[PDB]
Amino acid sequence: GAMNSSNYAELFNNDIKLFVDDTNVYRVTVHKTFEGNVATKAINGCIFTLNPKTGHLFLKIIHTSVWAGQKRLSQLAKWKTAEEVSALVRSLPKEEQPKQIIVTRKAMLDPLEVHMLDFPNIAIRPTELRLPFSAAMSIDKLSDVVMKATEPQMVLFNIYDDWLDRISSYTAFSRLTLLLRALKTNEESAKMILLSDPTITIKSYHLWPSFTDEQWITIESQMRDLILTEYGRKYNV
Amino acid sequence: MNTVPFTSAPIEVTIGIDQYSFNVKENQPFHGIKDIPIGHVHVIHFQHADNSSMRYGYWFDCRMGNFYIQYDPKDGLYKMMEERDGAKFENIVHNFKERQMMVSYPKIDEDDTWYNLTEFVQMDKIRKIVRKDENQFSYVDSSMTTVQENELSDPAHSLNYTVINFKSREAIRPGHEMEDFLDKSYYLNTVMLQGIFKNSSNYFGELQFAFLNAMFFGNYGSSLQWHAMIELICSSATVPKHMLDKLDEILYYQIKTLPEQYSDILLNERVWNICLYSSFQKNSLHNTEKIMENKYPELL
Ligand SMILES: CCOC(=O)c1ccnc(N)c1
Secondary structure, eight states, X not given: OOBOGGGGGGGGSSSOEEEEEOTTSSEEEEEEOTTSOEEEEEEOEEEEXXXXXXXXXXXXXXXXXXXXXXXXXXXXXXXXXXXXXXXXXXXXXXXXXXXXXXXXXXXXXXXXXXXXXXXXXXXXXXXXXXXXGGGGGGSHHXXXXXXXXXXXXXXXXXXXXXXXXXXXXXXXXXXXXXXXXXXXXXXXXXXXHHHSOTTSOOOTTOSSOOOOXXXXXHHHHXXXXXXXXXXXXXXXX | OEEEEBSOOOSOEEEEETTEEEEEOTTOOOOEEEEEOTTSOEEEEEEESSOOSOOEEEEEOGGGOEEEEEEETTTTEEEEEEEOOHHHHHHHHHHHHHTTOOEEOOOOTTOOHHHHHHTTOOHHHHHHHSOOTTOSSEEEETTOOBHHHHHOOOGGGSBOOOOOOTTSTTTOOTTOHHHHHHOTHHIIIIIIIIIIISSHHHHHHHHHHHHHHHHHHOOHHHHHXXXXXXXXXXXXXXXXXXXXXXXXXXXXXXXXXXXXXXXXXXXXXXXXXXIIIXXXXXXXXXXXXXXXXXXXXXXO
């Protein structure tokens, strides 16, 4: 059944699992036409598929060409997500295939269940957690590869950089969701925090800056402050 | 006309014959039911006055033999049986009529209700759902489970309904996942109609039979089957025109016949609202939609 606050630590056991998030698959800008009607223009998207134990991110880039001539794109986007996740699973050796796939939005359950009928032993699960993975496009290097793509493409990342050399996967996921929640609540301030100090750089093969243990504690504290603030700035408290 | 005689009525029981029913007192001088229309299947059913648990009964066709009822005090129920000695059977029936010990199947001449509820039902196909090959009639009761229910435990005593499962490889063609799940026409027309039933009459026959077991015995797995067969048609964009017209007539009479007070358990809100308001066939069931809206507007 559903993943929630009470079975949180199952994410860090030794059963392979993937989170799937489809919130950035179908993306548009809305604008006015010369006649003063409204129209959408699609921009490139991505499926966010994450192993929370290892940090491996399977970033499937959705090129706008996949929408050409199609109707009901928001419904199609859920099925295209399921089709790509199923193709990914089939591409993996049996011993790397997940035992569970956790979708971040309930609307993905039926599409994914149907595409995965060949894998009856893979559990498709929803979650009650309000995870901030929509903010993945606030990571500059992820946004950059999606926007530059000229064709469909899969790109592989470790979203934890080298953190697992020093911290556990539980702590690494807690850090990741804190950063992403901050970026979702106030992107500009969150990005200012992460990059205000020019002496701390992002390695070419990493996504985040090379903070020491002590600097991550200060960073993490600053992101909590930001989130709490915006919560007042918003609800006025 | 045909007759189903009763050896006796030793325990107080409510007796049903098709959509009719009457009460019989413990050891009342009751010897059966006469004037039963030939040409239709029928169901004779029972609810003991002492145990409203377990409604149970027998589907039969008068053309397939001479059948009678006899209470069994060991197994504690009214059992259907076949009399092979035809002479013995006419002699019995004639004596019981002469003494006027029988109730008359009470059909109004204008009244086509039973025909309209059983139009497509075949009795030889019913013996496939309720497998007991040594009898020509078929026992059903409230508690019997379906094959599909046993998958999700005694197979001898199960309802072998056609397995319908919308999230199954039978239902979904590789490479047409979204198409086949949102428009089930392939599954209705090719897998089920052409592949299993052979024709639409067999589809309506099982659908009519499932409904009647749900209504007369409160059989939960039968209600599931009735709603699934409805939903498969309503969720297909391409259905023969004659099938939709006939489905509308079928459902109309089922809704008309349902007890007003059982609507809350025999009717699945989700399927009906889909069929009448969201599905491809939302504008194709004019008679069913009108009786549903005038009789059970609460469900909608
Ligand atoms: C084989 C499942 O049942 C049927 O196909 C059936 C049931 C009742 N009447 C008819 N005509 C057919």
